[PDB]
Structures are given as C-alpha cells and as structure tokens.
Amino acid sequence: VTGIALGMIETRGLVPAIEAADAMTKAAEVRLVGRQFVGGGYVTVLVRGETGAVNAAVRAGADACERVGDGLVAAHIIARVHSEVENILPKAPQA
Amino acid sequence: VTGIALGMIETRGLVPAIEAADAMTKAAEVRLVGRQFVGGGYVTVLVRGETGAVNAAVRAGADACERVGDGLVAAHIIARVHSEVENILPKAPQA
Amino acid sequence: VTGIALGMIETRGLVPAIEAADAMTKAAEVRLVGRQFVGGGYVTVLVRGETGAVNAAVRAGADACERVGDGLVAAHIIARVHSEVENILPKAPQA
Amino acid sequence: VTGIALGMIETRGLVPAIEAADAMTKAAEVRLVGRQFVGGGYVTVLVRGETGAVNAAVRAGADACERVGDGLVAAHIIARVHSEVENILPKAPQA
Amino acid sequence: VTGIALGMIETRGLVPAIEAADAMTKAAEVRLVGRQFVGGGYVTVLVRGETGAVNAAVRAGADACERVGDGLVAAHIIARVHSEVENILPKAPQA
Amino acid sequence: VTGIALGMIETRGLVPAIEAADAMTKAAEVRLVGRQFVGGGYVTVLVRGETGAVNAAVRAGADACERVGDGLVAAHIIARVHSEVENILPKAPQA
C-alpha cells in the first residue's frame, strides 16, 4: 500500500510482460503502476511496494516470464529511488 | 460473456494477429478486448472468457496463426489475473 | 460494395504496401478500409468485399508487391470474420 | 500542378529521404505531398504529377538518395492509382 | 540547482535507463530533466547540473547501468551546450 | 540568421545526435530547426544557415558524433532545397 521500493521487469513483447505483472502481483503486496511500450519490442512493467514485497515480487515475475514468448530482458529492484527519479516513474498505467 | 480468464497471442506482424483473433473467437465464447501494437513488429491480441473457453480459444488461435506471415511469438492463458493486472488490460480495442 | 470478406497483405515498408493496395483495388471490386503502420517496418493494407472479389484482389496484390522494395510478408483472406473481429478492423483509413 | 501519377521512394532513415525529395522536386514538375515515418527506420516520400514528370522525378530521386546514409529501399511509380487508393495517400505533409 | 552542464546516458531498454537515472541523481546534485523513448529500443536519460556534478553523475550512472538488462549504449557530458541546443533539450520529463 | 542552406546529420540514438547538434551550432552560425525521431533508432538533427556556415557546421557535427554511442549514419548538405521541400522541413523543434 505505502512502500516506495521499485520493482522492474523488461521483456521482449507484451505477453511475457503480462505474465511478469501477474506473477509479481500474486507473489507479494505490490502495486502495478506502469506498463511501458519502450520501442523496438521492449515492454517494461513497474511495481511499487515495501522492500521485502518488491524483492519477492521481482523474483517471482522473473521466474514466470522467462518461459513465455520471447522472454526476459531484465529484472531489477531499486529499494529507494532518489526523489528526482519519481519524475520519470508512472503513477498509474494506461490501458 | 462474464468469464474473467485471459487469453493472449503475440505475433510478428498484424496479419497473423488478425488470423489468431478470428480463430480464437470462432473456437469458443470469448470476447476480443484488445489488439496492441507493441513496437518492433510485435502485435498482441487479448481475449476474455471463462477458463474452458479461453483454453480452447488460445489453442485454436495458436494453431491458426503460426502458418500466417511471420508467425507466432507466444500463446498464453492466465485463468484468473490478479486484480492489479486489470489496470493494464484493455477494456475494448481501438480500430 | 456490401461484401464482408477480408483481404490482407502485410509488407516490409510502405511502398510495396501501396503497390499491393493499387493492385488489389484494380483486380476486383473491393473497398480499401485500412493501411496500418504496425511498428518494426511492417505495414498492412486491408480490403473488404465479396468472397470472390477479395480472393482475386489478394492474389493480385500479392503478385504485384513481392517485386517492390523489401517485399511481401503475408497475404491472407478471411471470407467471414467472427462478429468479434469487427472490433479491431478499421472502418476507413487515415491519410 | 494537376497530374495524378504517384512517385514513391522509401529509404532507410530520414536523411536519404530528404535528398530523394529534393532531387525529385528539382528533376520535374511534381508536388511533394507526403513524407511518412513508417516504423523500423523506413521513411517514404511521395510526389504527385503528370506521368512523364513523375517518371523523371523518381529516376532522379533514386540516383541521388542511394549514395546518402543507409540508402534506398524502393523507387516506384503508379501512373494512375485506383480511386480507392486516394484514401490512403497524404494530401500534404506534416512538418 | 542552477548549473547548465548536460549529462546523458543512452541504454538498450528502459530498465537500465532507470538504474542510470537513479545512480546519476544519487551520485551528485543533478536534476533529472528528461527520459526519452528514441525508437528501436533506445532510451536516453538527461541530467542538468554544474560541471563537476554532471561529471560525477554520468560516471556513476554509466558504471551502474552497464550491468542491467541489455545495457549501455552511450555516456556523455556537454559542460556548456550552445544556446541553440536548449531548443531540443527537455525542460522536465513526462511520466 | 537568414540563410536557407540545410545541414543534416542522422545518428543511431539520441545521444550522438545531441553531440552533433552542439558541435554544428558551435562550429558556425546555424539555427537548429529540428530533431526528429525517425523510428528504428534513427535520430536526425537539422540546421539552417548560409552555405559556408552549414558546410562548416555539418563537417564539425560529423567529426564529433561518430565517436559517441552507436554513432553516425549520414551527414549531408543541401545548399538550396527546392521550394517544395520546405513543406517537409521542421520550422522549430519540439522539446
């Protein structure tokens, strides 16, 4: 609900990205704040939550999406982003 | 009509994606909720329905579209997406 | 004028796509309803008409555009798309 | 001024496309009606004019742009596009 | 706060770009002014600050993001951009 | 200020493009009128000025940006574009 850690998975294609998003949100209490079409085929899903939650989420999403479609590019956690980085992070996705 | 399972096919190009969409919707009672241009040439079609419907649909779409154009990237089902994932799923496509 | 069959050609680049569109529309009575920039360099042109018209059109467009530029990716006909698929098909192109 | 033939050059990148556009418009009396970013790096420039004008233009643009940057993909003329194809052709570019 | 030097990192994918942005902003007093989706999968993050700040920032971001996802494309500093270049530089990002 | 020659550099990525823009504007009296994301990763920067200015600018930008990131695709000058080509040239960039 109120944690500020950031979890991020980037995939080749939207399908593995949606699998990642589902596995992450089912794995721990994290909020899905963005899904971004990057260009070139990259898609990135972003979650916010407490450190431990985001840790468990990212690990789960990564294990899940590497088997789907063109797969996984990156799985990363930043437990406390600098206040400046909030300027580039999505507050809610657009669907 | 009211099922919440999710079916997804991602293709290289729009043509196999439209074949996928037609085969899926003809294969079982599923609703076509989105067609997404991902970037890089990826296109993803998304269907919602009951679990068994989405199962049959995805299987049909996958068999159909792998023979068309540049073909199939991914075919996947999530029978119950986390409530958070609804935030990134299209409610209706844009044409 | 009133036929609901669907003809589709996908090309690498816009130029072969315009050649495809011209050959298809000159080959039989079909309506050009969409030209779509897919991402990655894919372009897809879509025609509607009666079954026989769309058959002749797609065959003509395919023979024509494979010799132009980066060429042909896919040529496909769906003689009756499921009512659900109409949700993703363009009603008129944008130029 | 009033001719309806269509000249088209597709290039890898915008720079050779601008060279193409300049060579075509300097080579014969043709009107520059569109420059289109296709995705994947393809750019297409479109000219309208009388048949002979468009013939000379396309030949000139093609010779000119193949030496610039990533070069030429396609050079093509359609002397009379079907009335349906007008629906997908740009009336004026956007800059 | 008031320095006009420019720091820039370009990455393959958004995830390494967000890592870059975090490392740069944590490394020295710089302002994150832009994150740009370039097409093809390139993402570029831009920081402004005093010369020494931007120097330290870019070095930190570069060391950080080369280990994340598809990695680093470019890391560059322009300590005083020409007044003309301000016309193409983002004033604040969009998230 | 009032010259109509055109200088153009196309790069793989935005970073070398910004280096190009800075080197060109510092090298001679030219105005930066556009920076264009082309798709596929191509970026093109456009300068206007007198012939000699644009000559010196393009040469400087080219030497500068080939060492940055994924580098240089094309460097080109058109000393007097046809009046028709003005229709596709940017009047000012968007940042």
Author numbering:
A (entry chain A), B (entry chain A), C (entry chain A), D (entry chain A), E (entry chain A), F (entry chain A): 4 to 98
What text comes from the article?
The prototypical bacterial microcompartment is the carboxysome, which is found in many bacteria that fix CO2 into organic carbon. The carboxysome shell is formed mainly by the assembly of many copies of a few small shell proteins. Here the crystal structure is reported for CsoS1A. This protein and the nearly identical CsoS1C protein are the main constituents of the alpha carboxysome shell in the chemoautotroph H. neapolitanus. CsoS1A forms a cyclic hexameric building block from six monomeric subunits, as observed previously in the CcmK2 and CcmK4 shell subunits from Syn.
However, it was possible to visualize bound sulfate ions after soaking a crystal in 200 mM sodium sulfate. Sulfate can be considered an analog for bicarbonate, having a similar size and a charge of the same sign, though twice as large in magnitude. Difference electron density maps suggested possible sulfate ions at three locations. One of these sites was in the hexagonal pore, whereas the others were at the locations where the 2-fold and 3-fold axes of symmetry pass through the layer, i.e., where two hexamers meet at an edge and where three meet at a corner. Sulfur atoms scatter X-rays anomalously, so an anomalous difference Fourier map was used to visualize possible sulfate ions. This calculation confirmed the sulfate ion in the hexagonal pore, but was not definitive with regard to the other putative sulfate binding sites. In the hexagonal pore, the sulfate is in contact with Gly43, which is part of a Gly-Gly-Gly motif that is conserved across the three CsoS1 proteins (A, B, and C) and other closely related shell proteins, but not in the CcmK proteins. The negatively charged sulfate oxygen atoms are poised to make hydrogen bonds to the backbone amide nitrogen of Gly43, and possibly to the C-alpha hydrogen atom of that residue; the potential importance of hydrogen bonds involving C-alpha hydrogen atoms has been discussed, but their strength remains an open question. The visualization of sulfate ions inside the pores of the CsoS1A layer indicates that transport of small molecules such as bicarbonate is probably feasible. Recall that sulfate (carrying a −2 charge) could be seen bound in the pore, whereas the natural intermediate bicarbonate was not seen to be tightly bound.
